[PDB]
């Protein structure tokens with residue numbers, strides 16, 4: 025009775041928000057940008073290939089100086105690379121070799137990693153001794169950590185597979201906010217440029233816009249038909265892109281609260297592992313498990329190039345802060361920098 | 364009698380030149396296509412393409428020697444061409460047969476399971492061991508070149524092929540015996556492991572992927588050893604006893620290993636068998 | 648290159664040397680993924696052989712074993728089972744004392760069969776062998792006298808002794824191997840008062856290591 | 868089940884009261900950002916090799 029009434033109320037609210045998002049759908053992004061100049065063909069080439077990892081790469085993150093990048097691999101190693109000279113600054117041995125994410129702090133003083141041990145381990149790079157030691161081991165999650173992102177030197181936001189995102193205080197070691205609105209495993213994170221709100225793509229074919237200070241979900245985006253593995257904001261902070269296992273990428277607008285464009289091809293029948301935008305937002309770079317990466321025109325939904333050159337599944341990719349280079353990591357234990 | 368025998372041996376040499384060139388060219392060409400079309404290359408594949416290149420060189424040397432001898436006997440009678448051919452053959456043949464024994468050492472160290480400490484020390488340093496085996500065995504090459512040149516000098520001071528062939532055949536026996544010993548030890552290791560896995564563990568609930576696929580390679584390898592040790596004994600006895608038709612028969616026997624062993628190596632590598640099946644598919 | 652650039656190059660060379668040495672050490676280690684049901688019983692196996700996932704290290708006859716227990720991972724296993732694609736073997740522990748028990752929509756043995764069919768026929772474990780333990784044979788012997796095996800498998804039609812029932816259970820797990828050409832299933836019958844299981848794992852992993860060496864040599 | 872349903876109802880009610888804009892304005896804003904920042908995009912317009920850090 026009461027459960028049926030609440031289900032009817034939920035269906036009524038779902039139909040109301042569907043009708044409200046239908047009423048603000050006067051035009052389409054494909055129709056509006058049908059008279060803009062298309063970019064011809066993005067021919068990127070491999071400049072530096074980073075060797076040294078002996079197992080599959082699961083995560084990379086760039087630095088804010090656009091030169092230092094950290095990589096995570098199943099060999100229990102966290103290598104910090106100098107991308108200009110192709111040489112290793114640090115090689116951090118992890119206590120658990122089952123790493124699934126890595127993060128680089130904006131100040132550059134810390135790196136993070138986590139995975140099947142359900143622990144976000146934070147490493148101090150700038151110590152008086154010459155080594156990189158463990159600063160903290162944040163342990164409150166029930167499932168595997170999927171993504172971690174630094175807010176500053178004292179805060180980190182972690183996504184886990186126990187249907188929960190958490191925001192931590194590193195000095196205390198405790199979690200200040202728990203984000204609990206999902207249904208499946210949360211697989212991806214993306215922080216906004218102003219660092220006040222973030223999106224999380226999960227395994228319920230949904231992406232949720234969270235507020236860091238308030239701790240409540242603001243928007244829910246339901247367009248995909250499979251597990252979302254990758255998420256990334258637009259540089260503007262007013263839109264984001266999702267990469268799922270149904271071989272489609274989608275662009276969602278925060279203010280319009282719905283989907284603007286689908287980046288799909290009939291020749292692609294395999295999922296998306298990583299997504300990243302360009303500095304201008306014109307190019308959407310999506311890493312697939314057809315062994316290569318596809319460059320999409322974000323305003324016209326047309327492929328502009330293919331970053332072929334990886335012998336296994338491209339699991340992680342990221343564009344630098346200045347937009348000069350794109351580094352792709354894959355399961356063949358190589359990192360390649362494209363420009 | 365001699366003319367029809369020489370014609371039969373000439374037909375044999377043409378057939379084995381064709382087979383050897385096709386097989387070793389197929390090995391090198393398959394590895395080259397797999398290299399240029401962005402695919403991984405194992406260490407066994409590198410050793411196999413090294414054997415293929417060396418055997419192409421050796422079979423071209425012996426076929427060019429036969430072409431020079433048939434077309435230009437006056438050029439063939441000179442001591443300069445004879446000494447040059449002899450020394451170039453012994454260098455290329457030494458490198459080829461010791462690379463084959465290096466591939467055998469690679470197989471034996473990778474596959475066989477023994478409890479000896481020295482065996483394990485060699486077992487975890489296979490690349491270093493095969494490189495050391497190639498570099499150390501150059502003393503055999505230097506001593507072989509020395510003894511052949513002493514025999515040539517004695518022959519031209521007194522062409523003494525009855526001792527040149529014997530010295531070369533002795534110098535091929537040492538890597539052959541090493542390879543046979545490594546093969547027998549590998550078979551003994553596999554038999555000991557099978558006897559252990561037949562009485563403690565109830566074999567398999569599947570019994571599909573095991574040495575049941577490798578017995579084909581073992582059988583086609585032991586057949587080649589048997590039919591080549593027989594030809595060893597036959598050639599040594601016939602060269603020692605009474606023969607005066609030595610040049611064509613010895614030119615035939617020198618091409619037997621680099622022509623037939625590559626065909627044996629094709630039947631026994633999964634990549635080469637898959638490439639052969641794809642060739643036979645797209646030909647039809 | 649400057650002086651500091653040359654010294655950075657030397658530091659990278661030392662880091663590369665240490666990475667190569669660590670990789671050569673780790674390639675000689677045996678990695679095992681331990682799987683089972685909740686009531687199947689894996690703590691007695693780890694006790695005999697010695698949140699998050701649990702790594703157990705033990706050395707037996709100059710082999711370093713790494714055993715990984717993912718039973719505490721209560722998440723969707725399709726999102727992390729590819730992390731164990733490179734593994735020497737999978738140890739699947741099945742109690743055969745719970746054919747008569749229930750979890751009611753499936754039996755315990757049927758749940759174990761479904762998990763075995765999912766793991767064995769996974770796309771990441773085509774060439775990964777499975778070591779099968781049949782635990783609690785004493786309770787199975789003391790329970791087959793009263794309760795017949797017709798409760799679990801209704802199409803049995805065989806003698807209700809210990810040996811025939813155990814053979815039928817082993818055959819029913821080994822008939823779910825749809826590959827049956829590039830992987831092998833090793834079956835052992837264990838009990839609590841028995842210390843021989845590490846020997847069985849050693850024998851099976853030596854067989855798997857021989858097959859992997861033959862595959863790396865190109866002979867398969 | 869009652870508490871989860873009440874939380875879902877409250878979240879769906881909080882998600883409805885959002886000031887929405889049209890798709891046309893969102894597309895125009897994204898197009899304006901991409902046109903404004905097009906010059907400072909090395910992947911779109913490739914920089915010369917003198918100013919390329921990866922040469």
Ligand SMILES: CC(C)CCC[C@@H](C)[C@H]1CC[C@H]2[C@@H]3CC=C4C[C@@H](O)CC[C@]4(C)[C@H]3CC[C@]12C
Nearest residue numbers: 428445449528531532535595598613614616617
């Ligand atoms: C292992 C045994 C059975 C076979 C070994 C093959 C050896 C003995 C054969 C193969 C090719 C042969 C050479 C081919 C051509 C010539 C030129 C001629 O002036 C005779 C000597 C000489 C230089 C031969 C000497 C013997 C030789 C080196």
Ligand SMILES: Cc1cc(C(F)(F)F)nc(Nc2ccccc2-c2nnn[nH]2)n1
Nearest residue numbers: 467470471542545546549580581631866
């Ligand atoms: C084609 C094939 C198959 C097999 C196998 F059945 F054992 F897998 N073994 C070999 N060879 C050797 C094995 C041991 C020592 C030496 C050799 C050797 N001799 N010459 N070349 N390799 N070869």
